[PDB]
Amino acid sequence: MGPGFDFAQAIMKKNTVIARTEKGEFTMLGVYDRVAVIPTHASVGEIIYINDVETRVLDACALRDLTDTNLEITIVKLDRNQKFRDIRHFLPRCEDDYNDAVLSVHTSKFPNMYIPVGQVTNYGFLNLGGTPTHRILMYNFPTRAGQCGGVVTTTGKVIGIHVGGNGAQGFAAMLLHSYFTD
């Protein structure tokens, strides 16, 4: 409807796949080469389904900060025959607050879904499902079950992936450029 939704759509159309694990279907952001991200609660194993194709996982790393606190991001390398468009230049370098973000989801349950969530706070610490978690972004949108993995963008930046909510607010794990130095 506007330039925020334009940037979000461009990311969804080229840099997302549907990932299925034993814990459900997730929006999965491809970042570069065969490297994607997903919430750590997806419990990625040795095999994952990518757009309903059986795919070997070559590597999976549940990220933690240097205090050994959960970040709720898993970086996955996929045994896929095709590379993602490299979008690392759209990742922020530092922790920050944002104006006017969009949360975008693409699954069997929620195809082509875009939500204007508004202002995004650098919230920091969250007890997420009982797990102490750092680098959380917060937006005042009542996010529902099934949006985990959704991509959070502003115009020109891919800033996080949706990892939970409390019924009134939604929470995303930060994406930082330093996670994807090869």
Curated annotation (Swiss-Prot):
Domain Peptidase C3, residue spans: 2-180
Cellular localization per UniProt: Host cytoplasm
Top-level taxon in the UniProt lineage: Viruses
Reaction equation(s) it catalyzes: Selective cleavage of Gln-|-Gly bond in the poliovirus polyprotein. In other picornavirus reactions Glu may be substituted for Gln, and Ser or Thr for Gly
Active site location: H41 (for protease 3c activity), E72 (for protease 3c activity), C148 (for protease 3c activity)
Subunit structure: Interacts with host IFIH1/MDA5; this interaction inhibits host IFIH1.
Role: Major viral protease that mediates proteolytic processing of the polyprotein. Cleaves host EIF5B, contributing to host translation shutoff. Also cleaves host PABPC1, contributing to host translation shutoff. Binds and inhibits host IFIH1/MDA5, thereby inhibiting the type-I IFN production and the establishment of the antiviral state. Cleaves host MAP3K7/TAK1, resulting in inhibition of TRAF6-triggered NF-kappa-B induction. Cleaves host TICAM1; this interaction allows the virus to disrupt host TLR3 signaling. Cleaves host IRF7, resulting in inhibition of type-I IFN production.
Name this protein carries in UniProt: Protease 3C
Gene source species: Human enterovirus D68 (EV68)
Portion held of the full protein: 1549 to 1729 of 2188
